[PDB]
Amino acid sequence: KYQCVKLNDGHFMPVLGFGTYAPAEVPKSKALEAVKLAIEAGFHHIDSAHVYNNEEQVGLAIRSKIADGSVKREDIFYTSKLWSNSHRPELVRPALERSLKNLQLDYVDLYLIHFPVSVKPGEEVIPKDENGKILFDTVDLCATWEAMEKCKDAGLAKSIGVSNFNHRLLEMILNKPGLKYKPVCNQVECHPYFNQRKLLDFCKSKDIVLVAYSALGSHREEPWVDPNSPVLLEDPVLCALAKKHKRTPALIALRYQLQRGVVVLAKSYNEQRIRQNVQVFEFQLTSEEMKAIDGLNRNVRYLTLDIFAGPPNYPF
Numbered sequence: 001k002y003q004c005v006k007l008n009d010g011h012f013m014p015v016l017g018f019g020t021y022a023p024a025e026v027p028k029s030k031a032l033e034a035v036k037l038a039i040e041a042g043f044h045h046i047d048s049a050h051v052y053n054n055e056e057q058v059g060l061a062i063r064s065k066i067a068d069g070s071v072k073r074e075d076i077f078y079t080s081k082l083w084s085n086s087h088r089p090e091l092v093r094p095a096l097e098r099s100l101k102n103l104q105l106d107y108v109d110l111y112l113i114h115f116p117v118s119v120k121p122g123e124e125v126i127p128k129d130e131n132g133k134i135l136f137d138t139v140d141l142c143a144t145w146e147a148m149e150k151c152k153d154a155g156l157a158k159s160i161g162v163s164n165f166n167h168r169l170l171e172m173i174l175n176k177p178g179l180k181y182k183p184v185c186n187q188v189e190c191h192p193y194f195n196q197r198k199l200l201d202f203c204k205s206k207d208i209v210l211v212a213y214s215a216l217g218s219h220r221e222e223p224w225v226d227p228n229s230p231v232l233l234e235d236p237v238l239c240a241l242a243k244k245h246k247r248t249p250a251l252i253a254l255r256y257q258l259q260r261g262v263v264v265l266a267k268s269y270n271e272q273r274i275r276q277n278v279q280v281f282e283f284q285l286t287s288e289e290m291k292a293i294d295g296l297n298r299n300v301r302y303l304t305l306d307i308f309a310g311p312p313n314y315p316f
């Protein structure tokens, strides 16, 4: 057994997920080893994406742990994400199918619209013209969503949701004429320096689960994250709580999200830290402790993805 939350489509999501994105100079071979270790350690939820260029490796890890008897498919919750070169409705299903072919899995547990800004179709994930300008596309995300809905009806994705959607964009889905399935989740950046209280409350009001990414304060990889940004795990309140509980500031940050009703992801490729992260289920924080962490909030967004800024659907 393991701790899960019931989603608004009746499916269940394990409340601690393993993040698999790593910076491009980390060999992709490391994702295979990391995901096996995560499963060994007790992660039952794995988070990936077409754009991470690791599905072949993450799929092999998963297949390997099923084929060797360590786990059944039904006790792995695997997430993929639809990349912005395949937002046009007729391209959605084929993108899910290529992900599944690369994974050698029959279905994904969850399939997300990765990012609301669309780019031109084709093999290149960031297509650019000869002058280096990103080739943006104009796509109605309500039509993208209908195509997602069909992928759920075909059984290829058990559940569907979104990522990096703001209030306006969620409403655009929620208020869609003929809407068949709400998003089960909105995966977004969330941590004690950016606690997303406002959007969290909105999502709760609509029974959408907020899935927190960069919950340990991000990979901090340039140029995507401003190296001047404060180091979350160096926070003195988190480090003092850690010290007090004989845990680590990472565990404190992760426990904070579980108690506030958020599903939390944690990436690590390091064997010790992978094992340590499942200890989030071994301790609890008091109301006073929780309030102290709410106090750390400071409007710090680490991951702007501002290479996609300009178009109206840029969410930040």
Ligand SMILES: NC(=O)c1ccc[n+]([C@@H]2O[C@H](COP(=O)([O-])OP(=O)(O)OC[C@H]3O[C@@H](n4cnc5c(N)ncnc54)[C@H](OP(=O)(O)O)[C@@H]3O)[C@@H](O)[C@H]2O)c1
Pocket: 018, 019, 020, 021, 022, 047, 048, 114, 163, 164, 187, 188, 212, 213, 214, 215, 216, 217, 218, 219, 220, 233, 248, 250, 251, 265, 266, 267, 268, 269, 270, 273, 274, 276, 277, 303
């Ligand atoms: N939907 C989206 O657009 C989106 C955006 C960003 C991320 N994500 C997903 O969310 C996942 C997590 O976000 P993310 O990678 O920014 O990083 P994140 O989990 O905040 O973690 C960042 C850093 O924490 C380190 N770490 C892990 N456990 C630790 C521990 N116990 N003590 C000290 N350090 C620890 C990792 O290094 P080691 O590997 O060496 O441990 C990693 O570099 C990604 O892999 C991806 O699946 C999705």
Ligand SMILES: CC1=C(CC(=O)O)c2cc(F)ccc2/C1=C\c1ccc([S@](C)=O)cc1
Pocket: 021, 049, 051, 052, 114, 115, 125, 126, 221, 224, 305
């Ligand atoms: C959407 C996305 C994210 C968020 C995530 O982890 O889900 C991400 C995070 C990073 F630190 C760097 C890139 C990405 C990214 C997509 C992406 C963009 C350009 C490239 S390069 C120019 O080919 C590769 C990937």
